[PDB]
């Protein structure tokens, strides 16, 4: 097969003119049953049978509007300053302010921002891009192995309840906590062993990461430079 033959320069403008893209494609030379007794024959089945109850007032149909593209198929954009190997800051978490190591952009647009688990409370907890603040101080991460497996299907909370109506205990799901931690205990120790020798290099770093962040007295933001 072939790729698109036409590079992009400005959004929806091909680099070549219309009569030349005709002649880049060489378009001057390619102008082209029974199952029993007493029974009469093959009973034709009905694929996709007819519906029984018609609800007594139907709504009309939507008007299709455009190509609005549901959330799975949108796009992923990240702030320029949040490069891999950045020390991010949570804002909105239960962790809320701890200086937490960015690793990488997951497929959902969220960020997999590993707290150095020895240093913080924070495991490989995922956080959102706009609720975190970039900080100029860096760790090398480019030549660090990542696990292949970890993606959005791994980092989600799941539900199960046995009866439909109410009962006496709290859902048997929101009362008993999460114990995937048997599994995830290995994926994290496979990470922090791969990460902490990088952290050791900057000679004040692992105290800085242990710290938290607080707007103390007269330190206004916007004149703080991260």
């Amino acid at each position: 097969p072939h790729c698109s033959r036409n590079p992009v320069l400005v959004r929806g403008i091909g680099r070549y003119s219309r009569s030349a893209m005709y002649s880049r494609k060489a378009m001057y030379k390619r102008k082209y049953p029974v199952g029993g007794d007493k029974n009469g024959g093959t009973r034709v089945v009905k694929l996709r049978k007819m519906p029984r109850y018609y609800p007594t007032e139907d709504v009309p149909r939507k008007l299709l509007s455009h190509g609005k593209k549901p959330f799975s198929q949108h796009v992923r954009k990240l702030r320029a300053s949040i490069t891999p190997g950045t020390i991010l800051i949570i804002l909105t978490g239960r962790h809320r302010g701890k200086r937490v190591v960015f690793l990488k952009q997951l497929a959902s647009g969220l960020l997999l921002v590993t707290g150095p688990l020895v240093l913080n409370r924070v495991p490989l907890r995922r956080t959102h891009q706009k609720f975190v603040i970039a900080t100029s101080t860096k760790i090398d991460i480019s030549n660090v192995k990542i696990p292949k497996h970890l993606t959005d299907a791994y980092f989600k909370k799941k539900k199960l309840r046995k009866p439909r109506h109410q009962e006496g205990e709290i859902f048997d799901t929101e009362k008993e906590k999460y114990e995937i931690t048997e599994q995830r205990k290995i994926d994290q120790k496979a990470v922090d062993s791969q990460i902490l020798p990088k952290i050791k290099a900057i000679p004040q770093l692992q105290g800085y990461l242990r710290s938290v962040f607080a707007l103390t007295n007269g330190i206004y933001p916007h004149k703080l430079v991260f």
Binding site: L91, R96, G97, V212, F213, A214, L215, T216, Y220
Partner: peptide
């Protein structure tokens, strides 16, 4: 532990 919002 500390303040995360600015005062106004």
């Amino acid at each position: 532990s500390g303040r995360l919002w600015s005062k106004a």
